[PDB]
Design a protein around this ligand. Sequence first.
Ligand SMILES: CCCCCCCC/C=C/CCCCCCCC(=O)OC[C@H](O)CO
Ligand SMILES: CCCCCCCC/C=C/CCCCCCCC(=O)OC[C@H](O)CO
Ligand SMILES: CCCCCCCC/C=C\CCCCCCCC(=O)OC[C@H](O)CO
Ligand SMILES: CCCCCCCC/C=C\CCCCCCCC(=O)OC[C@H](O)CO
Ligand SMILES: CCCCCCCC/C=C\CCCCCCCC(=O)OC[C@H](O)CO
Ligand SMILES: CCCCCCCC/C=C\CCCCCCCC(=O)OC[C@H](O)CO
Ligand SMILES: CCCCCCCC/C=C\CCCCCCCC(=O)OC[C@H](O)CO
Ligand SMILES: CCCCCCCC/C=C\CCCCCCCC(=O)OC[C@H](O)CO
Ligand SMILES: CCCCCCCC/C=C\CCCCCCCC(=O)OC[C@H](O)CO
Lengths: 21, 471
Amino acid sequence: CTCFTYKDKECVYYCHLDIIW
Amino acid sequence: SPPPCQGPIEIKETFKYINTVVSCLVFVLGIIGNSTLLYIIYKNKCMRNGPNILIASLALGDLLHIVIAIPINVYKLLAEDWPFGAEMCKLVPFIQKASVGITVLSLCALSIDRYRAVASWSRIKGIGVPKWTAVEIVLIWVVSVVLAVPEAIGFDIITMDYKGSYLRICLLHPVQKTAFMQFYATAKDWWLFSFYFCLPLAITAFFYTLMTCEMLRKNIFEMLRIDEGLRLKIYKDTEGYYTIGIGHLLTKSPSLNAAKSELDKAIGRNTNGVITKDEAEKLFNQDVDAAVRGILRNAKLKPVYDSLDAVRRAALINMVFQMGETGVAGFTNSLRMLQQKRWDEAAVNLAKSRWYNQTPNRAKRVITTFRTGTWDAYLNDHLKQRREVAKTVFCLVLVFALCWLPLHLARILKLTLYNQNDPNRCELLSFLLVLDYIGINMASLNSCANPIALYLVSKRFKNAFKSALCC
Ligand SMILES: CCCCCCCC/C=C/CCCCCCCC(=O)OC[C@H](O)CO
Ligand SMILES: CCCCCCCC/C=C/CCCCCCCC(=O)OC[C@H](O)CO
Ligand SMILES: CCCCCCCC/C=C\CCCCCCCC(=O)OC[C@H](O)CO
Ligand SMILES: CCCCCCCC/C=C\CCCCCCCC(=O)OC[C@H](O)CO
Ligand SMILES: CCCCCCCC/C=C\CCCCCCCC(=O)OC[C@H](O)CO
Ligand SMILES: CCCCCCCC/C=C\CCCCCCCC(=O)OC[C@H](O)CO
Ligand SMILES: CCCCCCCC/C=C\CCCCCCCC(=O)OC[C@H](O)CO
Ligand SMILES: CCCCCCCC/C=C\CCCCCCCC(=O)OC[C@H](O)CO
Ligand SMILES: CCCCCCCC/C=C\CCCCCCCC(=O)OC[C@H](O)CO
């Protein structure tokens, strides 16, 4: 799971809930 | 800087229940099936050949994938946490992609091996495991491992404060350290879609198509061998003319030496009237091409031949071999019935002919082929084997495509639909979480499904699973 920027905390939280892939 | 969302990111408990039941079933069934498959292949010296060792590599990849992908993702779904530290953060996705590589490259290798088994005439038939297959599998595993290295470099634990609460997150972190790893972070999911889905689908579909095209030619050979015999020595046909192979007329001259000189010309060596089966098969394939060219130059036969499927085309070529282009054209009403696809009507009409009266055994088999569009009237061991090989490759490839598509679509949808500036974007993120966990379960269902497909498609495996499990 990845995100464009660390400052997108919603995307990072999603990766925290997301599958490992 | 992207705004916070107006809505939550969450996974509903009802989905967690359903997804975890599926995960446990795929896990238990996949470990039993792939372990039993491996034990079948190791225990039976009769099961240790080229393709089954490739299947063993696939089964090991299945087990690796199931063990690395399901337990950790069940844990993430239920615990919503990462307790295992950075080393496991890197190792788990590394091993996961290695096992996917082994799976797709083993599938690719099997489709090529099955094609070679049909197409090669010099391949020695027997129980051996070729020297090259051993190095073939080592290379599959080394390549799969090397291609997964970016996962071990790119994943790491980061920390953030998220609306008050401190989180430790294992992910492919934004801001990679080198230019290559930055590019990997942005392209990874197109890379996985291309190299681990589209490319093996294209490769196996290509070799499957080459293989089934070749099997069609083998079937026509076996059909005419049954009906006209394979004669490796010059003989005289029913009209007294020197002939060889599968009804290949050499000359109408009464001189055996004249027939021998024609034969030597067509083979390119001094045969003294005796050829090999490989030589007869090449001769036969040219005779089929010539019969087809003649059929297409015949205004009465061409419309019929065009409209027929490949099997029924072979029955028409069969009749042309037996009675020539002009004789076959004489079946005016029967050819019309075939062109209109009135199979049962054409079959009853063809049985009223002088052709059926003179050679009823052969005509019955050709008529069955016209009636059914199958090779059933020519069923022998080679045909049963070819049907099973075809179904095995088709089924393995189809289940791969269906099982892995959802996870790739999930990652592609995020790439194409996610707008980090949208304050409502967490509804999409919550939906993507569901697709992602479904996608993991479907991908692992592939690993679980491969032993089941072999059980249903292969009589040899079906019985092997019976001995190992029902006793
Ligand atoms: C990371 C930098 C590059 C280093 C990368 C190399 C090191 C890791 C590779 C290991 C695979 C080695 C080959 C292992 C082959 C196992 C094949 C196998 O298990 O196949 C089962 C079959 O029954 C067989 O007969
Ligand atoms: C997202 C998609 C979900 C579903 C995706 C499928 C994965 C689960 C299926 C396992 C069985 C697969 C093997 C089924 C084989 C059919 C039986 C068969 O091939 O029989 C051949 C026989 O010799 C003449 O028909
Ligand atoms: C026994 C081997 C031969 C038979 C082969 C079939 C075996 C089926 C057994 C287990 C799969 C189903 C187990 C179900 C476990 C459910 C746990 C669960 O659902 O809890 C998650 C919950 O949502 C948390 O919030
Ligand atoms: C290198 C090889 C790695 C091999 C694989 C290592 C990872 C296995 C870890 C966990 C599996 C756990 C299976 C399911 C356990 C669920 C426990 C749980 O979810 O906790 C409940 C939570 O606290 C409710 O609030
Ligand atoms: C598929 C079954 C077999 C799987 C196992 C095969 C043997 C492992 C061999 C090579 C792996 C090499 C690991 C790559 C080196 C780690 C890179 C790394 O950790 O980078 C961190 C980065 O520098 C920030 O500190
Ligand atoms: C019958 C098999 C023929 C041989 C196989 C050929 C290669 C396989 C390539 C694609 C298959 C899956 C395609 C459908 C999957 C979705 C593609 C997609 O969503 O991409 C759209 C666009 O690129 C914005 O993302
Ligand atoms: C058996 C194999 C085939 C199964 C394949 C299953 C693939 C995923 C299913 C549905 C996704 C459909 C797309 C849903 C798009 C939702 C759009 C949305 O929620 O928001 C859009 C966003 O706001 C704009 O920026
Ligand atoms: C009492 C237990 C439930 C009753 C028995 C049910 C049987 C389940 C079988 C098929 C359902 C299909 C599952 C399809 C998964 C879609 C999940 C989903 O989309 O929910 C996301 C939601 O929007 C988050 O915000
Ligand atoms: C062998 C075959 C196995 C078959 C096994 C059963 C397959 C059921 C799968 C999907 C049905 C799901 C239907 C559509 C679910 C998504 C609809 C949707 O968009 O959800 C709204 C979203 O959650 C708003 O927040």
